[PDB]
């Protein structure tokens, strides 16, 4: 790795026109209002640590015939905010996890009545020897998983 792996850039579509870069060296990358979060985004609607991205080693079930993408790394997006975050088309409730693909647009906060719309664009610039970068490609087609004691533990020491 050169230093940066994933790029979360609060796009103009969102009230925020900034760019965030998740250093492959930092796992997991926390985002939210509180500076404690690797990423700094303060939106009264979201919690201190609205959500955080975590990278994990991608491993298939079996490979005694077919040749998959080997056991590399996959970047996951973890959500801990109450307002809920939305990844493209998958819902992200407090304690959820979803795979992030190069060019993944995640919604941190959306309000129809308040017109409060936030969202960052995930762009993988560097691939630290990844199976691809983070496009999933497995049993379930782009599905939002739930967080476990492992993920919750990462934020516990935030």
């Amino acid at each position: 790795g050169n230093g940066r792996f994933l790029t979360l850039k609060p796009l103009p579509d969102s009230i925020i026109q900034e760019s965030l870069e998740i250093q492959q060296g930092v796992n997991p990358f926390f985002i939210g209002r509180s500076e404690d979060c690797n990423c700094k985004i303060e939106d009264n609607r979201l919690s201190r640590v609205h959500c955080f991205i975590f990278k994990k080693r991608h491993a298939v079930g079996k490979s005694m015939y077919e040749s998959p993408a080997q056991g590399l790394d996959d970047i996951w997006y973890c959500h801990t905010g109450t307002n809920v975050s939305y990844l493209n088309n998958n819902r992200m409730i407090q304690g959820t996890k979803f795979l992030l693909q190069d060019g993944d647009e995640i919604k941190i906060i959306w309000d129809k009545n308040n017109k409060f719309v936030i969202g960052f664009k995930v762009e993988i610039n560097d691939t630290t020897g990844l199976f691809n970068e983070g496009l999933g490609m497995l049993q379930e087609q782009r599905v939002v998983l739930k967080q476990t004691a492992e993920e919750k533990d990462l934020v516990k020491k935030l």
Partner: peptide, 9 residues
């Protein structure tokens, strides 16, 4: 002290 998440309706 600003500990309050403006949860939307």
């Amino acid at each position: 002290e600003v500990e309050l998440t403006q949860e939307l309706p």
